[PDB]
Design an enzyme around this catalytic site. Structure first.
Site, PDB file in Angstrom:
ATOM      1  N   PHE A  84       1.052  -0.869   0.036  1.00 20.68           N
ATOM      2  CA  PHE A  84      -0.506  -0.104   0.452  1.00 20.68           C
ATOM      3  C   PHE A  84       0.877   0.812   0.197  1.00 20.68           C
ATOM      4  O   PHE A  84       1.555   0.789   0.307  1.00 20.68           O
ATOM      5  CB  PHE A  84      -0.954   0.009   0.999  1.00 20.68           C
ATOM      6  N   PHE A  86       2.795   3.114   1.676  1.00 26.82           N
ATOM      7  CA  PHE A  86       4.039   2.972   1.707  1.00 26.82           C
ATOM      8  C   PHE A  86       4.468   2.459   2.291  1.00 26.82           C
ATOM      9  O   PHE A  86       5.588   2.481   2.652  1.00 26.82           O
ATOM     10  CB  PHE A  86       4.641   4.530   2.107  1.00 26.82           C
TER      11      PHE A  86
HETATM   12 CU1  CUA Z   1       5.271   1.488  -3.649  1.00 25.97          CU
HETATM   13 CU2  CUA Z   1       7.387   2.840  -4.936  1.00 25.97          CU
END
Ligand code: CUA
Ligand code: HAS
Ligand code: HEM
Ligand SMILES: [Cu+]
Lengths: 166, 557, 33
Positions: A84, A86
């Site tokens: 996702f 991050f």
């Molecule tokens: Cu997930 Cu770059």
């Protein structure tokens, strides 16, 4: 030299197309030798396995990160990875050594990569599809997961871990 | 009307020139971020500087985007609508129609101009691939939409100029330059539907707000239809240049008319059915077709190989003519004093490492080693920041005289290569770095300077990139001074300009004519080309078009 | 005269770099089996 010369070219040219078309099938060939043995599982699943990204972090095996290494053979282990904006759910992923991890990954938002570092595991993960690959970590330890796909400004910071228990 | 009867005799030098200016402007602006993005991979953060010079930038990744649209979409596009019309037009002493030929140029300025905006305003930082669901201001998708469609007007201009000739040299073969661009513009039309069906049905209503979602498996499959040929859309111009022009400025002759035709022939067959090499790591896209496209991709490497022979052969023949002698005696016999001749020859050295690159990458599974690592930014810089670009930069010296008037004093001849030799060396140094970290798993597409503890085994390639940043900044800056200076100081003196641009000529044979004659079935090979696409993308494209699974948009910067 | 010695010296090299690259890589594929 000059129209004479020209002939000699047209057979060299011929050697070139001959020799060159050759080594290419050697390649087409060598490829196929990888294409039929263990190291071939890092190749994404055929099928579309469709999902609904906006629900998947709330329901589905991708909802609970605690129960996402489900045993599945005497030695098979599915992992439900979610990737996702991050990181990776879950951080980390613990799998056993000498055994067959079948990764199943998906996105709740945008696209991501998942290049498990030191391995061939290297797959684009797309919102709403389920990328699926086999691997066996025959030798244990820490493996960092890098996202090699731009996904916004968390991008250069998106990593996670595989711990594979000795 | 004119104190330059310049644009009443022929205004194909009035349109073209505006193509190349726009072009060589896009290449300056976008290339601007280059060595900034270079030192990032060098592990030094340069953006605090850059954000302050041009205070309009907010992401590393916004630049990444400027650099990407403005070097690879705009600059290459423009430079081919330039050459790829102008040359054949001249090789036939015919004037391209000019409603259309001036219309196409409006399409491109109109387009880029519209897009440019979101992009500067950071309202569209989704990168030159613009992969949904990353969602970009409606205004950007309209940019590429028209800008790229401006390649539909020009396809006509050529194919007009095809019809009229053979209505008046009827029962005479197609002259080479023309014969090239014909297939090239046809092929490009096969590819030009990929991104076009993608822009229309998906991108535009989405970004317009007429659907909340797009299916990004299909979203990227239409892209990769268009998005491969498009590299060969960038190449063939410099190929054109190198085939017909090079051997002359380099003292010699095309060693074979038809080899050179064949080379292009297989580029309209195999340019398009080859998108999966880019989709190796997708899911949902059957392992079998990845294999197919992979075999096919190795097929498409077979033109550039014989090219390797036909060209080197020419230069060789030319080398001996200037009393070159040693096994390598032929090389220093070449006009190493001439930027016209240096830039694409350095182009082609460059082309070798960058060549094999593609092929590693091209073999299915070997993609999982390198895919999305900095290895990639290595290969393409070698191919397109380098060959296509140097072939373009270097074109300054024979094209820009021919076009404005304005000859090139020994001073320009000096800067000339100062630029070129710095460019090359830069592209070569940046090459090993990018290719090496690439294998130490530094991802591509990343602001890795902001995590300057994370790739500690990149230590050293890293340096290579730092250095190449300094080098290539040094060379951009000479290029600006050598662009604005070969244009703008006033030698719009009479004479010279007027021309056949140095075409070379050919060696001939018995065998030629039979072969040359078969490669002229343009409608016919347009068919196998179009059998091939439909045969290969068709049975996969059907599928996903039935499991269209749209997912929401995202801004994420 | 007689010989395109040069043009091959060129392709010989072009080949040997395709080989070094492809074979070099391949093994990384495997070293990461
Ligand atoms: Cu997930 Cu770059
Ligand atoms: C303009 C540019 C480009 C050209 C040309 C190009 C050629 C090839 N490429 Fe590529 N590429 C790939 C395979 C190939 C193959 C098989 C070829 C072939 O057409 C090349 C065949 C070339 C040769 C066999 C070399 C011939 C050498 C010659 C002709 C030089 C001779 C020198 C002489 C004659 C000098 C003589 C003179 C003297 C003085 C000695 C693959 C894999 O299948 C990927 C996927 C990577 C991934 O994971 O994403 C890829 C990724 C890219 C990307 C990344 C896209 C992105 O941003 O996501 C770009 C921009 C790009 C550009 C270009 N590429 N490529
Ligand atoms: C001035 C010299 C140049 C330097 C120093 C340079 C540097 C770079 C670097 C380091 C990257 C990798 C960025 C990343 O992966 O995050 C990159 C990307 C790229 N460059 Fe350049 N480059 C230069 C010139 C050019 C030219 C002339 C072209 C035109 C053909 C070009 C086209 C591209 C493209 C298409 C990308 C990929 C964009 C993306 O990842 O989305 N570059 N450049
Ligand atoms: Cu490609």
């Amino acid at each position: 030299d000059q129209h004479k010369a020209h002939k000699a070219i047209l057979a060299y040219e011929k050697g070139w197309l001959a020799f060159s078309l050759a080594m290419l099938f050697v390649f087409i060939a060598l490829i196929a030798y990888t294409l039929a043995t263990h190291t071939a599982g890092v190749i994404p699943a055929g099928k579309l396995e469709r999902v609904d990204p906006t629900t998947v972090r709330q329901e589905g095996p991708w909802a609970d990160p605690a129960q996402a290494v489900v045993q599945t053979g005497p030695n098979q282990y599915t992992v439900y990875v979610l990737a996702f904006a991050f990181g990776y759910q879950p951080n980390p992923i613990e799998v056993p050594q000498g055994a067959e991890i079948v990764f199943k990954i998906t996105s709740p938002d945008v696209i991501h990569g998942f290049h498990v570092e030191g391995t061939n595991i290297n797959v684009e993960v797309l919102p709403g599809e389920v990328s699926t690959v086999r691997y066996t970590f025959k030798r244990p330890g820490e493996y960092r997961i890098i996202c090699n796909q731009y996904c916004g400004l968390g991008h250069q910071n998106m990593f996670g871990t595989i711990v594979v228990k000795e | 009307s004119e104190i330059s009867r310049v644009y009443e005799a022929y205004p194909e030098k009035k349109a073209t020139l505006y193509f190349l200016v726009l072009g060589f402007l896009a290449l300056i602006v976008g290339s601007l971020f280059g060595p900034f993005q270079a030192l990032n991979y060098g592990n030094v953060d340069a953006y605090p500087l850059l954000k302050r010079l041009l205070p309009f930038v907010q992401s590393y990744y916004q630049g990444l985007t400027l650099h990407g649209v403005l070097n690879a979409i705009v600059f290459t596009q423009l430079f081919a609508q330039a050459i790829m019309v102008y040359l054949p037009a001249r090789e036939l002493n015919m004037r391209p129609n000019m409603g259309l030929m001036w219309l196409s140029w409006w399409m491109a300025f109109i387009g880029l101009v519209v897009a440019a905006l979101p992009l500067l305003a950071n309202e569209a930082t989704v990168l030159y691939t613009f992969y949904p669901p990353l969602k970009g201001h409606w205004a950007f998708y309209l940019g590429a939409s028209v800008f790229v469609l401006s390649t539909w007007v020009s396809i006509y201009i050529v194919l007009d100029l095809w019809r009229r000739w053979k209505a008046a040299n009827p029962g005479k073969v197609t002259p080479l330059v023309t014969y090239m661009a014909v297939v090239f513009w046809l092929m490009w039309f096969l590819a030009s539907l990929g991104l076009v069906l993608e822009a229309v049905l998906f991108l535009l209503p989405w970004s317009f707000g007429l659907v909340e979602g797009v299916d990004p498996l299909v979203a990227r499959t239409l892209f990769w239809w268009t998005g491969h040929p498009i590299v060969y859309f960038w190449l063939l111009p410099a190929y054109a240049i190198i085939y017909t022009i090079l051997p002359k400025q380099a003292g010699g002759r095309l060693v074979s008319d038809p080899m050179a035709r064949l080379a292009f022939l297989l580029f309209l067959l195999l340019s398009t059915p080859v998108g999966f090499h880019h989709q190796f790591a997708d899911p949902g896209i059957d392992p079998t077709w990845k294999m197919i496209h992979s075999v096919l991709t190795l097929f498409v490497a077979v033109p550039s190989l014989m090219t390797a022979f036909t060209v080197a052969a020419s230069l060789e023949f030319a080398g001996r003519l200037r009393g070159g002698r040693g096994l390598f005696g032929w090389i220093r016999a070449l006009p190493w004093d001439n930027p016209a001749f240096v830039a694409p020859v350095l182009g082609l050295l460059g082309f070798i490492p960058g060549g094999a690159g593609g092929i590693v990458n091209a073999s299915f599974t070997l993609d999982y080693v390198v895919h999305n690592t900095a290895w990639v930014p290595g290969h393409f810089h070698l191919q397109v920041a380098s060959l296509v670009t140097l072939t373009a930069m270097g074109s300054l010296y024979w094209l820009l005289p021919n076009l404005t008037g304005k000859p090139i004093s020994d001073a320009q001849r000096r800067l000339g290569l100062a630029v070129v030799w710095l460019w090359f060396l830069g592209m070569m140094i940046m090459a090993v770095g990018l290719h090496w970290a690439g294998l130490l798993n530094v991802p591509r597409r990343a602001y890795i300077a902001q995590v300057p503890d994370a790739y500690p085994h990149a230590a050293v390639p890293m340096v290579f990139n730092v250095l190449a940043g300094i080098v290539l900044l040094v060379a951009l800056l000479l290029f600006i001074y050598g662009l604005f200076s070969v244009l703008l100081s006033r030698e719009r003196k009479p004479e010279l300009a007027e021309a056949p641009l140095p075409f070379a000529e050919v060696i001939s044979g018995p065998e030629d004519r039979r072969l040359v004659l078969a490669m002229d079935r343009i409608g016919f090979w347009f068919a196998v080309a179009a059998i091939l696409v439909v045969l290969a993308y068709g049975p996969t494209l059907v599928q996903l078009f039935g499991h269209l699974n749209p997912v929401p948009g995202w801004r994420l910067w | 005269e007689e010989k395109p010695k040069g043009a091959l010296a060129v392709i010989l090299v072009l080949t040997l770099t395709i080989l070094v690259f492809w074979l070099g890589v391949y093994a990384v594929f495997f070293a990461r089996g």
